Amino acid sequence: SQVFGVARIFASFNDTFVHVTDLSGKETIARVTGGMKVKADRDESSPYAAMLAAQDVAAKCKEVGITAVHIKLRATGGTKTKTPGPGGQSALRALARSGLRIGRIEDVTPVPSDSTRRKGGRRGRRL
RNA sequence: AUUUUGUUGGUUUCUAGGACCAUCGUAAUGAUUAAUAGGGACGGUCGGGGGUAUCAGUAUUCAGUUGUCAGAGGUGAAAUU
Ligand SMILES: [Mg+2]
Ligand SMILES: [Mg+2]
Ligand SMILES: [Mg+2]
Ligand SMILES: [Mg+2]
């Protein structure tokens, strides 16, 4: 039917990555971050910047031949937060409303089997 | 060693007295409970109890291959980077 890439979306709390590869992931087709759409550091991870990022990502994809994508959402993971950033849901919604068709959706947040020590110290970050 | 042989050492037997040893006979012959104390044995277990090895798991960081291209990071907001 359609020709699938894989939209590997990394939505942290400081930025939002929209990166579409082939199925293998060794070939990158389009990579637009929320920081290429705004000039303020404070909203690099905003839903607005992620939606704009997906439209440019979506815009670049049609001219290469990608008509549909699979979604691999991840949060920062590791020792840091496992919840996705605010930009991951809007960039995903933008892709569906941009004419790209969506296949499988998966969370690929890296999750440790206990892991190494987390930054911040014993008492946490005191504010 | 108490006696008394007129005496004093006598003298060693005698006589008596403990103290043991054997035989025999008497006897209902002789060992308190097993603590809702404890200790110990034993039987199926049960535990993230301990020690020594051994095998996972993803993650983190660093590096090699790739791939694209302008930002990335981080914060309440930034800057150092
Ligand atoms: Mg406080
Ligand atoms: Mg008893
Ligand atoms: Mg049983
Ligand atoms: Mg050992």
Method in brief: X-ray
Token pair for A55: 């439209």
Residues A52, A32: Cα–Cα separation, whole Å: 9
Q: How far is the CA of A7 from the centre of ligand 2 (A)?
A: 77
Give yes or no for a contact between A34 and A19, defined as CB atoms under 8 angstroms apart.
no
Across all strands, nucleotide nearest A30 (CA–C1') = B68
Residues A79, A70: Cα–Cα separation, whole Å: 26
Count of residues in chain A: 127
Token pair for A82: 């496992």
Q: How far is the CA of A78 from the centre of ligand 2 (A)?
A: 61
* Protein-proximal nucleotides of chain B (any atom < 7 Å from a CB): 57-61, 66-79
- Closest to A25 measured CA to CA, from A10, A5, A11: A5
- Closest to A63 measured CA to CA, from A100, A90, A37, A32: A100
What string of DSSP letters covers A24-93? SSSSEEEEEEGGGS-S-GGGTT-HHHHHHHHHHHHHHHHTTT--EEEEEEE-S-TTS--SPPTHHHHHHH
Across all strands, nucleotide nearest A115 (CA–C1') = B59
